[PDB]
Design an enzyme around this catalytic site. Structure first.
Site, mmCIF file in Angstrom:
data_model
loop_
_atom_site.group_PDB
_atom_site.id
_atom_site.type_symbol
_atom_site.label_atom_id
_atom_site.label_comp_id
_atom_site.label_asym_id
_atom_site.label_seq_id
_atom_site.Cartn_x
_atom_site.Cartn_y
_atom_site.Cartn_z
ATOM 1 N N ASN A 1 -7.576 46.309 22.437
ATOM 2 C CA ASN A 1 -9.129 47.002 22.413
ATOM 3 C C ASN A 1 -9.982 46.280 21.543
ATOM 4 O O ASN A 1 -9.517 45.463 20.530
ATOM 5 C CB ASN A 1 -8.968 48.372 22.224
ATOM 6 C CG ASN A 1 -8.299 48.862 20.971
ATOM 7 O OD1 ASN A 1 -8.598 48.245 19.908
ATOM 8 N ND2 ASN A 1 -7.204 49.719 21.147
ATOM 9 N N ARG B 1 -2.951 34.350 23.367
ATOM 10 C CA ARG B 1 -2.423 34.344 22.084
ATOM 11 C C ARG B 1 -0.915 35.079 21.861
ATOM 12 O O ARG B 1 -0.773 35.812 22.690
ATOM 13 C CB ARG B 1 -3.354 35.505 21.371
ATOM 14 C CG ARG B 1 -3.296 35.339 19.873
ATOM 15 C CD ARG B 1 -4.142 36.706 19.305
ATOM 16 N NE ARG B 1 -3.626 37.117 18.109
ATOM 17 C CZ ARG B 1 -3.891 38.347 17.749
ATOM 18 N NH1 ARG B 1 -4.251 39.170 18.478
ATOM 19 N NH2 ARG B 1 -3.393 38.446 16.525
ATOM 20 N N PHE C 1 -1.164 43.671 25.635
ATOM 21 C CA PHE C 1 -0.142 43.046 24.768
ATOM 22 C C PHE C 1 1.133 43.411 25.603
ATOM 23 O O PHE C 1 1.287 44.421 26.086
ATOM 24 C CB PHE C 1 0.101 43.611 23.471
ATOM 25 C CG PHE C 1 -0.669 43.518 22.291
ATOM 26 C CD1 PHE C 1 -2.015 42.761 22.654
ATOM 27 C CD2 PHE C 1 -0.297 43.677 20.933
ATOM 28 C CE1 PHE C 1 -2.851 42.281 21.405
ATOM 29 C CE2 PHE C 1 -1.137 43.459 19.913
ATOM 30 C CZ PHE C 1 -2.523 42.567 20.147
ATOM 31 N N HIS D 1 -3.275 51.518 20.041
ATOM 32 C CA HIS D 1 -3.087 50.888 21.347
ATOM 33 C C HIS D 1 -2.552 52.047 22.326
ATOM 34 O O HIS D 1 -1.514 52.383 22.224
ATOM 35 C CB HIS D 1 -1.984 49.615 21.365
ATOM 36 C CG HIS D 1 -2.673 48.479 21.087
ATOM 37 N ND1 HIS D 1 -3.846 48.358 20.065
ATOM 38 C CD2 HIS D 1 -2.389 47.063 21.302
ATOM 39 C CE1 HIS D 1 -4.005 47.055 19.694
ATOM 40 N NE2 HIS D 1 -3.112 46.518 20.847
ATOM 41 N N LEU E 1 0.948 50.070 15.839
ATOM 42 C CA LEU E 1 0.100 50.200 16.834
ATOM 43 C C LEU E 1 0.043 51.411 17.631
ATOM 44 O O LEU E 1 -0.912 51.924 18.114
ATOM 45 C CB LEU E 1 0.208 49.189 17.869
ATOM 46 C CG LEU E 1 0.097 47.714 17.617
ATOM 47 C CD1 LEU E 1 0.590 46.576 18.593
ATOM 48 C CD2 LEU E 1 -1.482 47.155 17.131
ATOM 49 N N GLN F 1 -0.282 38.108 24.238
ATOM 50 C CA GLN F 1 -1.763 38.857 24.821
ATOM 51 C C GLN F 1 -2.378 38.119 25.693
ATOM 52 O O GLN F 1 -2.403 36.920 25.839
ATOM 53 C CB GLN F 1 -2.529 38.831 23.328
ATOM 54 C CG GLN F 1 -4.011 39.792 23.687
ATOM 55 C CD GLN F 1 -4.795 39.750 22.412
ATOM 56 O OE1 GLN F 1 -4.396 39.438 21.330
ATOM 57 N NE2 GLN F 1 -6.074 40.140 22.695
ATOM 58 N N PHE G 1 6.229 39.649 17.664
ATOM 59 C CA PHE G 1 5.125 40.537 17.554
ATOM 60 C C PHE G 1 4.760 40.745 19.060
ATOM 61 O O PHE G 1 4.943 41.828 19.842
ATOM 62 C CB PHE G 1 4.021 39.993 16.663
ATOM 63 C CG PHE G 1 2.615 41.160 16.621
ATOM 64 C CD1 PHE G 1 2.722 42.030 17.069
ATOM 65 C CD2 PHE G 1 1.437 40.455 16.449
ATOM 66 C CE1 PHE G 1 1.698 42.979 16.791
ATOM 67 C CE2 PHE G 1 0.377 41.208 16.088
ATOM 68 C CZ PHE G 1 0.626 42.585 16.494
#
Length: 179
Positions: free
Chosen positions: A112, A62, A123, A136, A132, A70, A67
């Site tokens: 997570n 992803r 990420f 995270h 985040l 992933q 942003f």
């Protein structure tokens, strides 16, 4: 304790795209750093899944522009999977200090499945992500190869889908002592 340094070599549709080198904040979150470090080397062998505890040949599944990237899902390849070296999942180690502040482009944080469910997925952030913070665990940053991060980022889309396979074709630790 000295911060380990680890690398990923990236390929895009089977062409070498370059190297991303990351520093891990063993000083702040040793258990989280060690998990990620050991997954870069593969040294722990096979998981509960029976797959290698290893990021080699895993995909960035992803990718969303401005942003994040992933990856780390070596059991399912699609965001649902992955395993830590301590087993399936582990608690959030800390949000103190560096663990509690996302630093924009190059920030490494654990993905997570809710509070206290860290596994192997991460990420590489590509922009500011203050939302985040405290969700995270931040455990490192990219210290070389931000150009390669930007290359991968441009191949994402709003939904996160990539139209080529973006693979960690190699990885490992850069050991302290050279010989």
């Amino acid at each position: 304790m000295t911060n380990p340094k680890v690398f990923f070599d990236i390929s895009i549709d089977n062409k070498a795209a370059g190297r991303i080198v990351m520093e891990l904040y063993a000083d702040t979150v040793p258990k989280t750093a060690e998990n990620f470090r050991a997954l870069c080397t593969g040294e722990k062998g096979k998981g509960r899944s029976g797959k290698p505890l290893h990021y080699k040949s895993s995909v960035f599944h992803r990718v969303i522009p401005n942003f994040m990237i992933q990856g780390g899902d070596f059991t399912r390849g699609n965001g649902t999977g992955g395993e830590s070296i301590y087993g399936t999942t582990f608690r959030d180690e800390s949000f103190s200090g560096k663990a509690g502040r996302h630093t924009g482009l190059g920030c490494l944080s654990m993905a997570n499945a809710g509070p206290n469910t860290n596994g192997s997925q991460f990420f590489i952030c590509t922009a500011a992500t203050p939302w985040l913070d405290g969700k995270h665990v931040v455990f490192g940053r990219v210290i070389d190869g931000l150009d390669v991060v930007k290359k991968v980022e441009r191949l994402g889309s709003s939904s996160g889908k990539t139209r080529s396979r973006i693979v960690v074709s190699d990885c490992g630790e850069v050991a302290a002592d050279k010989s």
